[PDB]
């Protein structure tokens, strides 16, 4: 019956931005008014649709992209943006339809001993295509000479950690970001609001 929005937004451990989980939501009724009017969300920005028409609208598929980014990087999850995350970790298409949802997760992800589990891609040969998922751990070739699998000068580990601390400012706190992508195609609109 009801769509499993609760599982996506209450998951105990979220994924890293570089490898972002893709869940397709179908064959259920989607209640949006519980999320929209919640007092636990910090960001709720919709692109291409109006924030209140979601209940009326019917879509073929809803895709929930769940990734952890740093506070200052929340503004990069939008169409037509650049940056370390926007270009190398998670790229949105220019004709994006959906809502970008984010909330402060400082009391859940940050550790006093240092949270290093979260990672982000720092070096890539080229920028990502929309909804491209790059999970390669291949050594970055900065120069014209081969690395041969060994690090050092001009051969670096492409991933980098965040290092979340409880004493950091708001701009460096972890924030969980769920992106609900609305895809419509020539199929019955099995997803519809109440």
């Amino acid at each position: 019956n009801l769509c499993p929005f609760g599982e996506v937004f209450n998951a105990t451990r979220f994924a890293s931005v570089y490898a972002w989980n893709r869940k397709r939501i179908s064959n259920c009724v989607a209640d949006y008014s519980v999320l929209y009017n919640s007092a636990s969300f910090s960001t709720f920005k919709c692109y291409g649709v109006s924030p209140t028409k979601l209940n009326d609208l019917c879509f073929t598929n809803v895709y929930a992209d769940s990734f952890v980014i740093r506070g200052d990087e929340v503004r990069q999850i939008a169409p037509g943006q650049t940056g370390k995350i926007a270009d190398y970790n998670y790229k949105l298409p220019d004709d994006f339809t959906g809502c970008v949802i984010a909330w402060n997760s400082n009391n859940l992800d940050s550790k006093v001993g240092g949270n290093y589990n979260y990672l982000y891609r720092l070096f890539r040969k080229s920028n990502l295509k929309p909804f491209e998922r790059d999970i390669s751990t291949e050594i970055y070739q900065a120069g014209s000479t081969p690395c041969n699998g060994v690090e050092g000068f001009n051969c670096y580990f492409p991933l980098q950690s965040y290092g979340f601390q409880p004493t950091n400012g708001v701009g460096y706190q972890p924030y969980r970001v769920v992106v609900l992508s609305f895809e419509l195609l020539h199929a019955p609109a099995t997803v519809c609001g109440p």
Partner: antibody, heavy 121, light 107 residues
């Protein structure tokens, strides 16, 4: 005109800690990495340690590993090096050098060098 | 610690003839991860070659390099008056990146 402009010379008493920095301009600093070397007057060059500014991973030579903290500030395109417990023999000219790095690709050698700063203890 | 032996310590040679400089490594070093620097007196060093045999930009054709696993050689075809300086080799293969003793070329 890709250069690396550091600060001027300093003369400090023994036991204090000195802060040295190099400010990059004209090229993409984040892709590149900075190596720190020192050369006393009339002697050879000694390698303090290098840092990749983008990653922030700092490697230090074994002799000076305990006493050097090599940090970077990406916002101002500046690499910092700090020496503690300055002893009389530590007086030397300190250099910083980074490869000319474009966004897509980097130069295989350490092309750009600094002007050199004298530190007297 | 990869000690870089340098021979000879000093070199006295007239301009116009050939010169052979030697950078000796304690153990084998990757050819690509090496560079040569010219330090003029009272000046910063300046890179001439990288990867043993690949000349860097802005250096004339006279300077040349020979590559091998444990032997590295720099050769100057024609000595010029401004080319008399202390030359240093560096290995980027393994940390620490040591420097050689330095060979001074004079007349």
């Amino acid at each position: 005109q890709v250069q690396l402009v550091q600060s001027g010379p300093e003369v400090k008493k023994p036991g204090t800690s000195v802060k040295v920095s190099c400010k990059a301009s004209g090229f993409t600093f984040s892709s590149s990495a900075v190596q720190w070397v020192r050369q006393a007057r009339g002697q050879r060059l000694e390698w303090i340690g290098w840092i990749v500014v983008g990653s922030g991973n700092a490697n230090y030579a074994p002799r000076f590993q305990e006493r050097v903290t090599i940090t970077r500030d990406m916002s101002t395109n500046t690499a910092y090096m700090e020496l503690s417990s300055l002893r009389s023999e530590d007086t030397a000219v300190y250099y910083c050098a980074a490869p000319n790095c474009s966004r897509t690709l980097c130069y295989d050698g350490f092309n750009m060098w600094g002007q050199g700063t004298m530190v007297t203890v | 610690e990869i000690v870089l032996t340098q021979s000879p310590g000093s070199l006295s040679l007239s301009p116009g003839e050939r010169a052979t400089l030697s950078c000796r490594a304690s153990q084998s070093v990757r050819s690509s991860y090496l560079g040569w620097y010219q330090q003029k007196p009272g000046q910063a060093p300046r890179l001439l070659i990288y990867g043993a045999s690949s000349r860097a930009t802005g250096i004339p054709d006279r300077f040349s390099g020979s590559g091998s696993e444990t032997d590295f050689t720099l050769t100057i075809s024609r000595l010029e008056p401004e080319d008399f300086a202390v030359y240093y080799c560096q290995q980027y293969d393994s940390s620490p990146w040591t420097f050689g003793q330095g060979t001074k070329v004079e007349i």
